[PDB]
């Protein structure tokens, strides 16, 4: 199972941020404009417009799948292995072959 890491947006308002591309799995970086964050308690910066949000998100393996993974082997050749019991005279023995 995957896990979507979502770093906190870098809202460089009163300016202009740029899409800093990366190489993480399925990495997505988007840059918006004309956005007015509204952090609790009032506006987020003295500007009224001309602001940018550098939203980014990328996939990553779940924090725990050393325990919950599903292998995808590719099997080609078999190999028999049998446990046999033999009873002649009196040996009453069992062997692995």
């Amino acid at each position: 199972e995957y896990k979507t890491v979502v770093p906190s947006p870098y809202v460089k308002c009163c300016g202009a941020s740029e899409c800093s591309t990366k190489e993480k799995p399925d990495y997505q970086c988007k840059v918006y404009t004309g956005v007015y964050p509204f952090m609790w308690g009032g506006a987020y910066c003295f500007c009224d417009s001309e602001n940018t949000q550098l939203s980014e998100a990328y996939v990553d393996r779940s924090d725990v799948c050393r325990h919950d993974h599903a292998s995808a082997y590719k099997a080609h050749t078999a190999s028999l292995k049998a446990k046999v019991r033999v009873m002649y005279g009196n040996v009453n023995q069992t062997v692995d072959v």
Binding site: Y10, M39, W40, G42, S62
Partner: protein, 317 residues
């Protein structure tokens, strides 16, 4: 002792985040804000993560009856006994530390986490999460039996050790608060309040800086300046609802409290069926009391397999 386990939280703090609901369908910015439910145990035990800290008092001290819930700009102390993590039913808390609660909620659609703040109020966050635990095995029982098998189901350990799992961190942003700015009959006063508020005042040229005291720039108006604290002492937890500061993810590494471990697990053995012999066939009188499996394969060549969930008495042949 456990005090060593809390040496990491000395530099962290709770934060206020968006909720989109507080049990009344209204945007909150509630101090409690569920971030991610992490059901991954075959046993079934949610690991709710929310914007608060349990077990640590306001004074950065271990105490299993205190909750650090953010409020305004300073931390507070809320009695832990007022924790009511409850889905459609009511979860039984299985211990908590830091930001992660442990629950065993009954089936439901929504998850609600609530704490009682200092002023005997009820802050809560309620998010949608289709919780529907399915106990390990082949019988979807409800409560543990007494005489049954023992199959392995992984669960979240109560042990609050250090785990390889990590949660990111970064310094908080510059929180804005218009209450600091106040008109003074044609002048403006900014209550420092032991903070490091900044300002990008448009009233008059050169009115930019980070005052550390009760600066009282005059001849200005309320809607001519943007005041915002610049607290940088403690750390927040990389919330998607918290605009990060300019610094690119200083990446503090608070360890996730509760790990996942392989443990045994009980399961009932269903009623043995009443076989009825017949010509080249049987007719079983299945007598369940909760959804069980039933699969028969003809161990010849090219079998005739089958697999179905029996919910009530049937007469499968």
């Amino acid at each position: 002792s456990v005090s060593q386990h809390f040496n990491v939280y000395k530099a962290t703090r709770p934060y206020i985040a968006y909720c989109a609901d507080c049990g009344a369908g209204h945007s909150c910015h509630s101090p409690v804000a569920i971030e991610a439910v992490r059901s991954e145990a075959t046993d079934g035990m949610l690991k709710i993560q929310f914007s608060a800290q349990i077990g640590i008092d306001k004074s950065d001290n271990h105490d299993y009856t205190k909750i650090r819930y953010a409020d305004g700009h300073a931390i507070e102390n809320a009695v832990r006994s007022s924790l009511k993590v409850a889905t459609s039913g009511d979860c039984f808390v299985h211990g908590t530390m830091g930001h992660f609660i442990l629950a065993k909620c009954p089936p439901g659609e929504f998850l609600q986490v609530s704490i009682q703040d200092t002023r005997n109020a009820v802050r809560a966050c309620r998010i949608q999460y289709h919780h529907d635990p399915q106990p390990v095995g082949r019988e979807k029982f409800t409560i543990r039996p007494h005489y049954g098998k023992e199959i392995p189901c992984t669960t979240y350990q109560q042990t609050t050790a250090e785990t390889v799992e990590e949660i990111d961190m970064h310094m908080p942003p510059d929180t804005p608060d218009r209450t600091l700015l106040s008109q003074q009959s044609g002048n403006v006063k900014i209550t420092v309040g032991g903070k490091k508020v900044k300002y990008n005042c448009t009233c008059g040229t050169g009115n930019v800086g980070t005052t550390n005291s009760d600066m009282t720039i005059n001849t200005c108006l309320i809607e001519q300046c943007h005041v915002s604290v610049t607290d940088h002492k403690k750390w927040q937890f990389n919330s998607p609802f918290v605009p990060r500061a300019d610094e690119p993810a200083r990446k503090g590494k608070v360890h996730i409290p509760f790990p996942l471990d392989n443990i045994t697990c009980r399961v009932p053995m269903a009623r043995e069926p009443t076989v009825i012999h017949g010509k080249r066939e049987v007719t079983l009188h299945l007598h369940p009391d909760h959804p069980t499996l039933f699969s028969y394969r003809t161990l010849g060549e090219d079998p005739q397999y089958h697999e179905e969930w029996v919910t009530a008495a049937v007469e499968r042949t």
